[PDB]
Ligand binder design. Sequence first.
Ligand SMILES: Nc1ncnc2c1ncn2[C@H]1C[C@H](O)[C@@H](COP(=O)(O)O)O1
Ligand SMILES: [Ca+2]
Ligand SMILES: [Ca+2]
Ligand SMILES: [Fe+3]
Ligand SMILES: [Zn+2]
Length: 440
Amino acid sequence: VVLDKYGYPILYYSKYEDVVIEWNPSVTPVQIEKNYEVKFDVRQVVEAYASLFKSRLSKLKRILRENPEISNVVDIGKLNYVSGDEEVTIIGLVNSKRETNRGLIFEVEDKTGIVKVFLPKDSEDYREAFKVLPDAVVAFKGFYSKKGIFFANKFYLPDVPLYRKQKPPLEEKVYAILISDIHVGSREFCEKAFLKFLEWLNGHVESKEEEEIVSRVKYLIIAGDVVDGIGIYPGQYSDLVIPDIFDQYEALANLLANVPEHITMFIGPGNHDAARPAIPQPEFYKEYAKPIYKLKNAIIISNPAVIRLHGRDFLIAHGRGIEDVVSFVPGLTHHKPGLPMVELLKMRHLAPTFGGKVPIAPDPEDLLVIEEVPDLVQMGHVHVYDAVVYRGVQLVNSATWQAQTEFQKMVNIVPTPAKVPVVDVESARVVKVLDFSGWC
Ligand SMILES: Nc1ncnc2c1ncn2[C@H]1C[C@H](O)[C@@H](COP(=O)(O)O)O1
Ligand SMILES: [Ca+2]
Ligand SMILES: [Ca+2]
Ligand SMILES: [Fe+3]
Ligand SMILES: [Zn+2]
């Protein structure tokens, strides 16, 4: 039985009040000038979705037009004022996508019209056109039939540039720790493993290599589902140790209070959190999430957000779009979220698909478009660790601190709890993975 305070689900044990972890005096932290900036946050800004699709198309059409190979772009509404002798390019939203034994049928829409696009079974760009999600913005080079079909010979994705200038080296080596899906309130939360991680952060390490990493750790990024929430799915009460949203954030803040002062924490919301029930999520609902807003070394970031650390862009998102990829693309699955993450980077959109349990807000501007090329992309949500480099960009899933729940077992989700990516800010790369799973 769920309860509501002003409409929001609030309720239906210890809150880590006693938890005190002090810094190891034996370890001295390397004095590095903290260079950080929130480069992008959601808060820095008839048909309900008309303005959203206009924004999405405009933004991604700009990214496509930056490809030197894309030329002779013509409006879809002008396609039969064009003779069948002229090779043209069209840019538009993938409204529908259907496979025949003879190829792929797309319904592509721009601001001037809609057109049926045919791509033959094995045009060298087929593998990519077969993977593209609907409501993504793409380009097609080909000829118009005058029967009503665009006979494409080339398919283009917004992509990431193959060539980008290398960044100048930093004065000192600095590390960033990536975590997500803590799920405080859940009986499956790896409480001991997380306490051992807080000890590790406070210089309580047993090797010289770990000691030189901990001394240089200045940033901690938390990519959503920081609490397990209330009324997220039917039967959730059977899994909750802390069945109160206020007490969940209070328990979380008591743990996160034990994070060293020399570490700057960047905390973003997820789908279990007390935040907007659609994406993008500006921040957390301050009425419920207040204890984390009061942490001295914490910065509440939006979902999504772009954090510039020492000149390196870290795009932080919860990971709702990974689900869109695994449902729509056969062959791509969890146990490896790295490849689905690459597809989102290539589409330059975090969650293009509409209709899923993925609620996309009918906002005036599309803030889910990856407008600028990041150095690192961090996502959570799927509860499985992975890391893959695509054209100099590091794609990484920060896993979870939650062991397999009753519900996860039923929907066949197998997590990899307590696997922590260690990022070298200079190269914006995962250099090590801390494994605290022995404590699960
Ligand atoms: N209803 C449902 N069916 C199937 N798969 C699901 C469902 N809800 C979540 N998930 C998956 C998505 C992630 O891989 C994992 C953790 O999501 P999180 O929501 O953070 O617990 O569970
Ligand atoms: Ca030793
Ligand atoms: Ca059973
Ligand atoms: Fe989660
Ligand atoms: Zn989630």
